[PDB]
Design a binder for this molecule. Structure first.
Ligand SMILES: *[C@@H]1O[C@H](CO)[C@@H](O[C@@H]2O[C@H](CO)[C@@H](O[C@@H]3O[C@H](CO)[C@@H](O[C@@H]4O[C@H](CO)[C@@H](O)[C@H](O)[C@H]4NC(C)=O)[C@H](O)[C@H]3NC(C)=O)[C@H](O)[C@H]2NC(C)=O)[C@H](O)[C@H]1NC(C)=O
Ligand SMILES: *[C@@H]1O[C@H](CO)[C@@H](O[C@@H]2O[C@H](CO)[C@@H](O[C@@H]3O[C@H](CO)[C@@H](O)[C@H](O)[C@H]3NC(C)=O)[C@H](O)[C@H]2NC(C)=O)[C@H](O)[C@H]1NC(C)=O
Ligand SMILES: *[C@@H]1O[C@H](CO)[C@@H](O[C@@H]2O[C@H](CO)[C@@H](O)[C@H](O)[C@H]2NC(C)=O)[C@H](O)[C@H]1NC(C)=O
Ligand SMILES: *[C@@H]1O[C@H](CO)[C@@H](O[C@@H]2O[C@H](CO)[C@@H](O)[C@H](O)[C@H]2NC(C)=O)[C@H](O)[C@H]1NC(C)=O
Ligand SMILES: *[C@@H]1O[C@H](CO)[C@@H](O[C@@H]2O[C@H](CO)[C@@H](O)[C@H](O)[C@H]2NC(C)=O)[C@H](O)[C@H]1NC(C)=O
Ligand SMILES: *[C@@H]1O[C@H](CO)[C@@H](O)[C@H](O)[C@H]1NC(C)=O
Ligand SMILES: *[C@@H]1O[C@H](CO)[C@@H](O)[C@H](O)[C@H]1NC(C)=O
Ligand SMILES: *[C@@H]1O[C@H](CO)[C@@H](O)[C@H](O)[C@H]1NC(C)=O
Length: 734
């Protein structure tokens, strides 16, 4: 017996490709001492080899492990098991089998073989590649199961649920098959003990699941399909219902009657429900902990009855047309509230003083994209121990100043005050927000300098201050913020140079400094930013030459890195640069016209990516409209991910490096308005991704390369080059 146990386990170990995996599994040694093994009274009862790259087929598993007498559970989640299940001798003692997150493949009918495990009651085969080929007939025939998870497979087809349940489901308590492409009907009316049903993210577009008496159902998730019928009538017999998730479908009309007496979580998000919030929902106030109505067509006010929902932790009403003043009278009674999301509505008026009390309970306050006005509450975080982590007030009409008292929201992780009409300075006291990761204040009328005090915020990742009236230089304090990964200061009136300490921000992925008055040379230390993929310096007063060293990472960039990209059309003179990459969270695109008084560019063309290992490269480089000079370092050509390169409008001379032809990712290439001479390198015919080029206003000569993409570009892209010829230009005179 021990003999048999140890021979089975060691035989399993020996079939493993990796010889480091079960280092302590050893023959002539008791398995009860092995890692991965659970024993009771010196007998093996469970094996857990999850998250270990075994790289063997199911046949090895069923041969060795599943035949172990007395084995009660086997956990092999994320263990690189492949192959298919099939017939094997299986212990009567085995009650749970977890094969999730593997590479099991073949028709789901293979699972019928697990019927040989007479004791099997729990089965997880989620996140594999099981499918259902053609004719959906017969049955799964595992009607002893209490729990079955077939989620995230490759099951495509109609009435697969009927197939799962055809042979009986009187024992079933938990059915999940989410994340497939199943369609048709769901009939669980004979599953009288079913407590959990998840058919979400599938291809259901016809009937609502038929639940029958719905006598044990507590959790119902049909979200992420295309359903439109009468779910209300479907769930009306479900008196045990705690979670109802019908989000991301195609339901319409007003919120219908619902079974409210046991309800904890309700989501109707992402449908087309209309009307006001009806007062009958009040019946769930004894139990309701989470409510989500986001992304519908609701309107009107927030009903006073919400005052009695004392257990409500989360109220999400974003993206509707709710209106009126902040219903503080009601919000104050919601003892339990931690998340309040009213963003993307039409709430208006000023912030009430009572709101300050909420700083004491909420973790998240989201009022972004409404019609609020007036000052931001000076006293907001006045309470002894405020919990507030996220404060989103962006895209409103707030006036006045940023209250220094926000330094008292001690747990603040994210502060978004962008797209308002705030004036005054950036309070130095935000320096004492020791956990702050995101500071976003762009598109306001902020003045003064960038607080040196930010140097106290070690956690800082995001500093977005575009479109203000900020002056002075980049404070050396920012050098201490080594987790900065996104710095954006475009469209201020800043001065001075890029500090060389810039080099020691190994996480900086985006540096946008356009339309200021920065000067001096480009620091070669820029090449020491191990994360830099987006460098925008257009429209400044930079000078000197381009440092080859700034490219010395093209390189071992580990990985890649919520925004809007607004492309410059090329029909406006006063509009400079390839285009603006701007932070765009909780902001309506409709309000982008608010830039009209700051930005000479049109705003019509709004846009919202590769994968790296250690191959990653700079993706975006724009240094146009400066006073640069010298020669383009041929290292310029070392960036296979560079899809944009704008060096237009400088005083760059010498010839175009042939290495430019190595930039296989290049879509845009602007080198117009410079002192460039010599021949356009033939190598540039290798580029096949170009959508725009400009080499006009240089001193280029010789023929335009006959191959590549040149012929597809108009004469304009080549004008003002005396000795240049060849189509699209006039034929060269040999
Ligand atoms: C770098 O930054 C500076 C400073 O922000 C920026 O200069 C500013 O640019 C804007 C846009 O060109 C100017 O626009 C002001 O406001 C309106 C836009 O709504 C301008 O255009 C029209 O104004 C008339 C007024 O009667 C109006 O009827 C019309 O509807 C407007 N057209 C629209 C809808 O676009 C005005 O010309 C102008 N108003 C004033 C103050 O006279 C700002 O004035 C500029 N502010 C300055 C110069 O400090 C500059 O363009 C940026 N550079 C780059 C390359 O982006
Ligand atoms: C079948 O196997 C699946 C794959 O393991 C299970 O899916 C996983 O279940 C976990 C529990 O729900 C999830 O845990 C995550 O990690 C933390 C750990 O502390 C949890 O709190 C979170 O709920 C969850 N993620 C976070 C951070 O929110 C796994 O995420 C989840 N993975 C998925 C969904 O693919 C199934 O649960 C299992 N089925 C059954 C019936 O047991
Ligand atoms: C799920 O959505 C619908 C419904 O099954 C599928 O649309 C079908 O498209 C095929 C053509 O490939 C037609 O033969 C079917 O008649 C369509 N269905 C109907 C009723 O119009 C869609 O293909 C399915 N998606 C997947 C990936 O399974
Ligand atoms: C209700 O259903 C939605 C849609 O299935 C769930 O949202 C999913 O997970 C997150 C949001 O939490 C998003 O990524 C998507 O909207 C959904 N899935 C994916 C992978 O995109 C939501 O979590 C469900 N709510 C509950 C509590 O069950
Ligand atoms: C870039 O701008 C700076 C600051 O205005 C200038 O610094 C120049 O540096 C070199 C030193 O040999 C010379 O061009 C001048 O002596 C400096 N000018 C002055 C008085 O500041 C200069 O305009 C630009 N620097 C470069 C590299 O040309
Ligand atoms: C299972 O994985 C191994 C390891 O790569 C491979 O050799 C074998 O062909 C795979 N079997 C199937 C069914 O793909
Ligand atoms: C939203 O509500 C406001 C205030 O009642 C109303 O004036 C406006 O027309 C509504 N907007 C839409 C899109 O229905
Ligand atoms: C950051 O600046 C330097 C880093 O070497 C040093 O004075 C100190 O460690 C830091 N200062 C602060 C504000 O912690």
């Amino acid at each position: 017996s021990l003999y048999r146990e140890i021979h089975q386990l060691i035989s399993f170990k020996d079939v493993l490709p990796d010889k480091n995996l079960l280092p302590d599994w050893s023959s002539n040694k008791n398995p009860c001492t092995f890692d991965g093994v659970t024993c009771r009274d010196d007998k093996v009862t469970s094996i857990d080899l999850s998250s270990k790259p075994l790289n063997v087929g199911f046949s090895a598993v069923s041969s060795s492990l599943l035949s172990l007498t007395g084995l009660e559970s086997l956990f092999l989640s994320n263990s690189h098991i492949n192959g298919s299940v099939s017939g094997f001798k299986c212990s009567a003692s085995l009650t749970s089998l977890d094969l999730s997150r593997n590479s099991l493949s073949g028709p789901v009918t293979t699972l019928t073989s697990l019927g040989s495990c007479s004791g099997l009651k729990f089965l997880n085969v989620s996140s594999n590649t099981l499918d259902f080929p053609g004719k959906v007939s017969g049955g799964l025939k595992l009607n002893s199961l209490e729990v079955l998870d077939l989620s995230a497979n490759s099951i495509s087809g109609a009435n697969v649920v009927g197939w799962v349940l055809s042979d009986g489901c009187g024992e079933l308590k938990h059915l999940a098959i989410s994340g497939n492409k199943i369609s048709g009907d769901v009939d669980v009316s004979r599953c009288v003990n079913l407590e959990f049903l998840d058919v979400s993210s599938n291809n259901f577009s016809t009937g609502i699941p038929f639940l029958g008496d719905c006598s044990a159902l507590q959790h119902l998730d049909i979200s992420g399909n295309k359903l439109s019928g009468d779910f209300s009538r479907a769930i009306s017999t479900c008196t045990e219902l705690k979670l109802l998730n019908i989000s991301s479908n195609q339901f319409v009309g007003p919120i219908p009657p619902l079974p409210l007496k046991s309800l904890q979580y309700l989501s109707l998000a992402e449908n087309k429900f209309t009307g006001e919030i009806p007062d009958f929902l009040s019946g769930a106030c004894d139990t309701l902990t989470g409510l989500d109505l986001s992304g519908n067509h609701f309107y009107g006010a927030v009903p006073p009855f919400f005052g009695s929902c004392s257990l409500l932790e989360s109220l999400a009403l974003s993206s509707n047309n709710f209106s009126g003043e902040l219903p503080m009278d009601t919000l104050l009674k919601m003892r339990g509230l931690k998340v309040l999301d009213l963003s993307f509505n039409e709430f208006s008026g000023e912030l009430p003083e009572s709101l300050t009390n909420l700083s004491a309970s909420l973790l998240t306050l989201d009022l972004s994209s409404n019609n609020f006005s007036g000052p931001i509450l000076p006293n907001l975080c006045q309470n002894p121990k405020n919990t507030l982590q996220e404060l989103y007030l962006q895209n409103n009409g707030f006036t006045g100043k940023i209250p220094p008292t926000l330094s008292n929201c001690s747990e603040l992780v994210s502060l978004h005050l962008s797209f308002n009409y705030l004036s005054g300075t950036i309070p130095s006291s935000l320096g004492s927000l020791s956990k702050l990761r995101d500071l976003k204040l762009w598109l306001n009328m902020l003045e003064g300098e960038i607080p040196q005090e930010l140097m106290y915020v070690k956690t800082l990742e995001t500093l977005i201050l575009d479109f203000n009236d900020l002056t002075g230089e980049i404070p050396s304090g920012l050098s201490n913020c080594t987790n900065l990964n996104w710095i954006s200061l475009s469209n201020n009136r800043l001065t001075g140079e890029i500090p060389k300490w810039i080099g020691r921000l190994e996480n900086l992925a985006i540096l946008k400094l356009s339309n200021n008055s920065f000067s001096g040379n480009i620091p070669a230390e820029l090449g020491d930013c191990r994360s830099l993929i987006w460098l925008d310096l257009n429209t400044n007063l930079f000078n000197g030459t381009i440092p080859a060293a700034m490219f010395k990472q093209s390189g071992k960039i580990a990985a890649n890195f919520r925004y809007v990209y607004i492309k410059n059309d090329g029909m406006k003179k006063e509009c400079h640069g390839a285009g603006n990459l701007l932070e765009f969270q909780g902001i309506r695109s409709e309000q982008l016209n608010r830039l009209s008084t700051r930005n000479p560019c049109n705003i019509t063309s709004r846009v919202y990516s590769p994968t790296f290992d250690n191959n990653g490269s700079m993706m975006f480089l724009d240094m146009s409209y400066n006073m640069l000079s010298g020669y383009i370092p041929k290292e310029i050509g070392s960036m296979p991910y560079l899809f944009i390169l704008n060096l237009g409008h400088n005083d760059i001379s010498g010839s175009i490096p042939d290495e430019v032809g190595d930039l296989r990712g290049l879509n845009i290439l602007d080198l117009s308005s410079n002192k460039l001479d010599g021949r356009i390198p033939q190598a540039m015919s290798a580029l096949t991704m170009l959508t725009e080029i400009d080499l006009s206003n240089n001193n280029l000569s010789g023929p335009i390369p006959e191959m590549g993409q040149f012929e597809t570009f108009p004469p304009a892209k080549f004008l003002n080059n005396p000795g240049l010829c060849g189509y699209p230009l006039p034929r060269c005179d040999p």
